[PDB]
Amino acid sequence: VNVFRLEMEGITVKGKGCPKPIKSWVQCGISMKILNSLKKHGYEKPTPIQTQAIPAIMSGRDLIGIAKTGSGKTIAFLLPMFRHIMDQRSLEEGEGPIAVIMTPTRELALQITKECKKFSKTLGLRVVCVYGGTGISEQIAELKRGAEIIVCTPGRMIDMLAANSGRVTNLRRVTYVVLDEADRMFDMGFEPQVMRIVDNVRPDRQTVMFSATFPRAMEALARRILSKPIEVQVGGRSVVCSDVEQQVIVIEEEKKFLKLLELLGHYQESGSVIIFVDKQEHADGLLKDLMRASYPCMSLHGGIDQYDRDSIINDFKNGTCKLLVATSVAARGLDVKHLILVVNYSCPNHYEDYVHRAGRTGRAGNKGYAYTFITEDQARYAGDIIKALELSGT
């Protein structure tokens, strides 16, 4: 029932027919060797980019993932590919790899080969040992004995394809095409080499691309080579609106009412504002304290009747009530044009309620103000609030 909490963690997902992210590597549909390598490497919890890319690579569809530096994109490209190679074994033909990994640098290709050897440890699968600027005879002797994956330079791959040392057959040769640092491969320098690498490939083969940054033109150039791609970045799915300004202040539980009274008294946050509370009794007490302080305020919660809540909503929409106290039920789905300010005095336990409270004000391209009071008790939601502020650009 907590499938929405994995998507709210902050992982923009785009595409049709996207599988659910896995919580751990033990229930991700991986083989025994990949799980043994993950247990030997010391991975207790998987990365969110890895949890978004591993079912998309296990399902057999094209995926394009973007994340920060050092997030584990090489392991996220090597582990489901090795799991699909171990689960669906094929005949190791001559001079034909089952996977093609493209790296723009020789040191990056050597690091990808070392990561693939560490992910395929305690097994007979040796992928590749080749780099640019070295002896081609040793690389040909290493590739002639058997090659599972092909992680090298595009120039070395073009030289191997021109000298008939390595190529992709038409019927069944490779099933996955990995592209590490796809922003550099889609540039003007590596365009015809990547075009000749993608042209001489099998028709029934998946294409994977991973990079730290991704421009619009590079993504538009890379989307033409893939067939129905699935995008995975951060953050978009269940994220806060960028048009509404978010503010977080560190105050106590008793000082929150004084901060709200100072924002209503000194600043212009009293009129046309929606105040989110934790419970209905606390919202009624805050509404009574606002009405006792010579300020017109209305309240809408589950403890009140439906007609009184409708009258309070009509008074907030018409302009009769300056402030409107509401619970978490009115945070999502409410589309009021008068709600310009969103005062979150009580922080919710879930980030989706805070995202719905921030998105309730300043919609349809308009600006908005959102001020939330962060306390010491909401320490678990502070990381989610920081991730939402980093995704929304606040």
From Swiss-Prot:
Motif (Q motif): 23-51
Entry superkingdom: Eukaryota
Start and end residues of each Helicase ATP-binding domain: 54-232
Motif DEAD box per record, residues: 180-183
Residues noted as binding ATP in the record, renumbered to the chain: 67-74
Domain Helicase C-terminal: 243-394
UniProt function note: Component of the 17S U2 SnRNP complex of the spliceosome, a large ribonucleoprotein complex that removes introns from transcribed pre-mRNAs. The 17S U2 SnRNP complex (1) directly participates in early spliceosome assembly and (2) mediates recognition of the intron branch site during pre-mRNA splicing by promoting the selection of the pre-mRNA branch-site adenosine, the nucleophile for the first step of splicing. Within the 17S U2 SnRNP complex, DDX46 plays essential roles during assembly of pre-spliceosome and proofreading of the branch site.
Oligomeric form and interacting partners: Component of the 17S U2 SnRNP complex, a ribonucleoprotein complex that contains small nuclear RNA (snRNA) U2 and a number of specific proteins. Within the 17S U2 SnRNP complex, DDX46 is part of the SF3B subcomplex, which is required for 'A' complex assembly formed by the stable binding of U2 snRNP to the branchpoint sequence in pre-mRNA. Recruited to the 17S U2 SnRNP complex following release of DDX42; DDX42 and DDX46 bind the SF3B subcomplex in a competitive manner.
Family according to the record: Belongs to the DEAD box helicase family. DDX46/PRP5 subfamily.
Protein name as catalogued: Probable ATP-dependent RNA helicase DDX46
Annotated gene: DDX46
Section of the entire sequence shown: 350 to 743 of 1031
